[PDB]
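Hello,

Following up on my earlier ticket. Below are the nine sequence lines again, exactly as submitted.
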Amino acid sequence: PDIIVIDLKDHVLGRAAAIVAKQLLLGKKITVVRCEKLTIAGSEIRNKIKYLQFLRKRKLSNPKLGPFHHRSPSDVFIRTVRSMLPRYTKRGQRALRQLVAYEGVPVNVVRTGGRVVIPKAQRHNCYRNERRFTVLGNMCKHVGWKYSDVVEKLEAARIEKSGRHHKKMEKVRVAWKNARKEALKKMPQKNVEVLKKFGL
Amino acid sequence: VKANYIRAGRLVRILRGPRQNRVGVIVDIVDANRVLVENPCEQKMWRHVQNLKNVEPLKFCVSISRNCSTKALKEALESKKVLEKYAATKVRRPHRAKKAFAESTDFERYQLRVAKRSRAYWARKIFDENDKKNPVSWHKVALKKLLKNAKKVDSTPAAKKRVEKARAARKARLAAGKSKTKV
Amino acid sequence: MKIKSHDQITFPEDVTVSVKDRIVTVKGKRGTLTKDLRHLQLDFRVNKKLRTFTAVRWFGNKINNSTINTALSHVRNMITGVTKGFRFKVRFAYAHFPISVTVENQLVEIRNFLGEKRVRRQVVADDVKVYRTDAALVKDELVLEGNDLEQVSREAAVMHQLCLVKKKDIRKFLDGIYVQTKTNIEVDE
Amino acid sequence: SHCKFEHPRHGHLGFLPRKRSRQIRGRARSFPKDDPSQKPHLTSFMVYKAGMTHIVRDVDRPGSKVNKKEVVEPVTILEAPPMVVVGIVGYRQTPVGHKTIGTVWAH
RNA sequence: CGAAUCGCCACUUCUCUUAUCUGGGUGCUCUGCCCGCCCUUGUCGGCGCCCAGUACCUUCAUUUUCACAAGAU
RNA sequence: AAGAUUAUCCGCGCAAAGCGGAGGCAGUCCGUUUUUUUCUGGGUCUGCCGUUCGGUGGCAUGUGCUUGGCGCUGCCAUCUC
RNA sequence: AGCGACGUCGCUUUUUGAUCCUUCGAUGUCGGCUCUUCCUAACCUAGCGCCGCAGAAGACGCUAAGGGUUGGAUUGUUCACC
RNA sequence: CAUAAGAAUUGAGGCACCAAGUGGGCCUUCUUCGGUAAGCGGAGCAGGCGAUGCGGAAUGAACCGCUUAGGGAUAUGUGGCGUCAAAACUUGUGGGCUCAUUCUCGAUACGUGAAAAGGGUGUUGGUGGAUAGGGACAGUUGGACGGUGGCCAUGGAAGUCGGCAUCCGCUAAGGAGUGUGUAACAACUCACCAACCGAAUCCACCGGCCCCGAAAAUGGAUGACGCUUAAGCCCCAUGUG
RNA sequence: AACGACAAUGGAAGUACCUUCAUUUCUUUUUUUUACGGCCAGACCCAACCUCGCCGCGCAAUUUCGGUUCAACAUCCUUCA
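Thanks for your patience. The regenerated structure is below:
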């Protein structure tokens, strides 16, 4: 399949990563959005400690070269995926070079399709539907992560136009509904038409 | 809105066992995730005990005693006709069809597809109202463009002299048309 | 996994409630008061459309069972504000040093403590309304009231915490501005 | 092992690395942030350092020691005339920071 | 001639050596908002409402629908 | 990027709906109409006619500035394009 | 409070021992000066809890290592010590 | 050589000539000595390693598996089947427990911080007692009075700093008095019960999983990621029904 | 016309490039690929490995209280027993 774009609203982080990991591995440029609704387990406290501790390390002489913390929600995930990928593989790297993720969602591109999410990666589906959990943006907020506000704005816009579009479709789709009907049961009979039971 | 309650004498759907999609009804719930189920189907479903993970209740709930007999069951549940009622449920379509789909052949298929093709260009777009409605971008646009080409025709670009020249041009297309086919 | 299940709500009478979503929207005399609950969804089943609503569970775990109550009560209290409102009485209390509190209205200003130190100020959040009342021997008295106890209270408890003191012994410390009656605005229907 | 007494180290971790650094034209690591209530207002000016001297002006404050005194103080003088406004710029904040969106001209 | 990247797609096809795009939102608490309701009014059971789900587009104009020319060199 | 939009335009308007605004003329090469709706086009060459500019000059004026010079605009006219 | 006997388990390793793995065709012995950074079992600083804290003062504990944390004298020192 | 009743083996046995290379070992199940100890010392047995690699234990002389012609084809070993990384993201066909602001829930045998004591109404499941519908248990409600200091120390306690005390009545019950303390009286309280109450509840035990307990020097490592309707822990299964 | 995350040369593997060797060759000759007794292995499809014996089933029966209902009764049986 080409040009792929997956919607990360409510997706279980690790699993989604891994899953994708294999995907990337098997080779394909795939894309994530609604990344902010990627999910982390339980409590912000918990999420912080982990990040904090991660952030906290150094490369003592030149701390500037151990780990960097692009604190985009995207960047978290992807990096995870790198982690779940074997980085130092020259191949994986190229693999990486393939891979695409944007935080949020640059719009125009979802409109006749884009219905796409990935199996196990459905966080409620993964998580017990009664266990506690925490959301990615919230984490990235917790570590600051700049655009959040902006992102919001952007989101609202996106929805609107999408709605606009949507209404428009809404209109046609009735016409589209209106697609016959009429003479259409004069599908055959010899050599067993049950198009009537089939798709009709 | 959480609602299809298991209620002994509820009709449940076999969801992934081999014994999937036979039918039967609750003859017990053996607790947490298991059922005791029964049917009149001569070969599957006898009285089975089946996992609840695997089942879907079908929204036909009858009355019958919790923990019960085939014979009683067979007839009251026959009398309940819910099989039929369930039979009429729409959900059902594709999957009884699925089994079918497996076993079609090409021609059939082509027709089947063709059905929609038949409709396609023929009963939506076609016509004239809804294609005066959205319409298709070209239509919509041609119409709209036509208001923006009331612009030439009608209006403030164009067409009071130059379209007269367009008339000259129009024939010019035909002058070449005639010529070009005449070689 | 062991079945609690999740769901919705119990009820009384003259006050409308959401009955839907995580959110109870309670509407009565004093308006409408509404709350959105998180994991707090639990075996509902409507018993009358307008007249009976309960949520008193079938199976599940230990921890679950508690919540059920805690949930009703609070929404009941959503009803309470909406019906009979909340009225908190506070009195400033002091002996060695006189203490003064006024109410800006939009905010509450607290003066004098220990000769006064800082000025304690609390902005009056919504519907906690604040009255310094004094006639009728209303007395060093603030009155917080409105139709959300939790808020009326929260603001209140906050106040008790606004009148804290440290260093040099509770056995000589007392003075501060303390809760004197947490109630309803009245009895009402 | 630890060394024998305290004090604190020399110098502050940031200006570092200490370079004969680039772009020597006036790096301005931020700017104020908008109040619509305030009239649109320009927020800076570029100028030339001229030099210093000392100035006399009066003291006072609420309860300073040197209140009510005339004071003499060092001051700077900076050469100034006008900058001329030559364009208008919009950067827009994108969830990746400012990216210029447009530039407007002198003619 | 009885397989043999094959001749296509395609230096203006490219996120990649071969379906278009079926598009927007949300919760578990809903197969249509679905809905609504009724009912020993419950765990409900029943009934109702609506079109809406009933995921889902594969390009001759067909191929609802006769049908027809042309491989082999 | 805006629609599964490449056609004589633009502007405006979520968006509707809609709106407005939208030069000409002759001469010249090449040739289609077709992401399912141009519709004579395409295409350059010229010519020919005119907002703008561009330049020329002048007259005022506004503006602004040094070792009274430097710097720039109005309008007018000219000039040219 | 604060202790904590008698017990009796912990815990640590900036002690000291034990052990000789490694190191003898080589890993430059003391101390100290300098200088950094780090650790926390926080002395001071921020803020909480206790007090056998009235005030007063201290004490006890938490949360806290971001911040701070000396001049001499004498003494190679170390330690010691005014 | 039968029993009537009780081997197996025996890819030879017999038998010998003569020369090397070695004498520091080290590791282990098991036993065991010295000493607190020690990856310590020091023996006993077997096995290794040494002197081998292959395959497994993210990492390892000696742990697991297994030893080796050269190959080929096949299947297993140990070990796996979330992803990094082959294999059920185990579902059809499957079970619990467990949630863990810890520098942080935990999680491969060997393995080796297995923190220890020692705790914790975290959860999770016993056992012993119960009381228990003639009413138990909570929550209430009413009363907790009277014959009477029954009393003694006693500055001052008639029930009540303190100490020996204590029966009747009324009853549903109410102590010759549970506290609080006017120096003592008083008062204040409820222990004692009915009434309410209406169902479990009450006590002790129990042991389980789970947490506190739980502090040192470079950034930091269940391998890494992460995983928690697990990819934990434990359990079974790959299975009809 | 050789290449470069950064160990370095290293194994193994294959491709690319190659300067490459040596071999064999079609109008009855080679070459890659189909195909083929009996074979010569491996995998699918149905049959059955028996059987004494419970188990049960049925009946009745006792004990044995549960779903229906607003509950009781029906419905001593929902049923376990």
